[PDB]
Design a protein around this ligand. Structure first.
Ligand code: PAF
Ligand code: PAF
Ligand code: PAF
Lengths: 165, 167
């Protein structure tokens, strides 16, 4: 398994996978992975040659800084679990790599029809960075899954959005 | 030169270009092309294997229906100029095709750091960038606020697209 923390190195591998003809699935996560997140990984492995999992606790989608600060961070353990599940690549960026000037002045994506603006923004950016053929999301957060399906339909992303029960 | 009017046929074209691994340049336009747009096309041709030009009068970036309705439409003459320049693809969608559920509740992109005009720009250019997935995209320097907007949008949103400003 490859663990990538920077944009240039991620871009290099995305390009390599593209030149190798790999079908790529992305599983976005905020880390603190449990057996339940493996449903996403297992669906992704069946549906692609290569599985990339992002781990990024996204400040733009937390209403309270207290909650962002207390969100569990267990990177070594997440990566252990992913490596055992045969994941190919983990993308684990820093906050500043994602939001160089902070979130308040960052370009955002809003899906009509703070929390959800944070979700469409980071998921669009992960789609632009990883350029996956397929991306897997839980059905449990049904508002989030609805928001991403609409975002994709509206914004022209060529990505199959897979809801996992 | 091929004229592509629908998303699924554009999808077909872009998927094919991707698996062929060609380097692709996109020139976004609203048609009514003249010398300045030809400079954009020339640059795109010099910088990529394949050049796509979009022609789409984007309602989201016009505040007044009167201004949208007055915008000149010269598709035949636009295609004549692009064909002469050996453009590979011209993407010329209808409004219903880009906005099948209307602009009002369409996803939008807004870049901080007429009310509505720039939001309409960032939104359509993001969508064009997702649809076409170009390696490079050319814009004029004269609309300097637009060029700055797109420059920031690309840097912020993580698009792997080289932005080229042309006089
Ligand atoms: C989709 C996601 C990883 C985006 O930050 C997050 O909202 C989540 O944990 O569902
Ligand atoms: C898979 C999951 C943990 C992702 O948030 C959630 O959808 C769930 O519990 O099914
Ligand atoms: C960039 C653009 C094609 C977006 O509709 C338009 O604003 C233009 O022609 O400058």
């Amino acid at each position: 398994m490859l663990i990538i923390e920077t944009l240039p190195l991620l871009r290099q591998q995305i390009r390599r996978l593209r030149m190798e003809g790999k079908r790529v699935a992305l599983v976005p996560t905020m880390g603190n992975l449990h057996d339940g997140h493996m449903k996403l990984v297992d669906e992704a492995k069946a549906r692609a040659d290569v599985v990339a999992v992002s781990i990024f606790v996204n400040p733009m989608q937390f209403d309270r800084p207290e909650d962002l600060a207390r969100y569990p961070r267990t990177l070594q353990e997440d990566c252990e679990k992913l490596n055992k599940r045969k994941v190919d690549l983990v993308f684990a960026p820093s906050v500043k790599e994602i939001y160089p000037n902070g979130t308040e002045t960052h370009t955002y994506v809003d899906v009509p029809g703070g929390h959800f603006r944070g979700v469409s923004t980071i998921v669009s950016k992960l789609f632009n960075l990883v350029q996956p053929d397929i991306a897997c999301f839980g059905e449990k957060d049904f508002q989030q899954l609805a928001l991403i399906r609409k975002m994709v339909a509206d914004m022209g992303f060529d990505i199959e959005i897979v809801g996992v029960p």
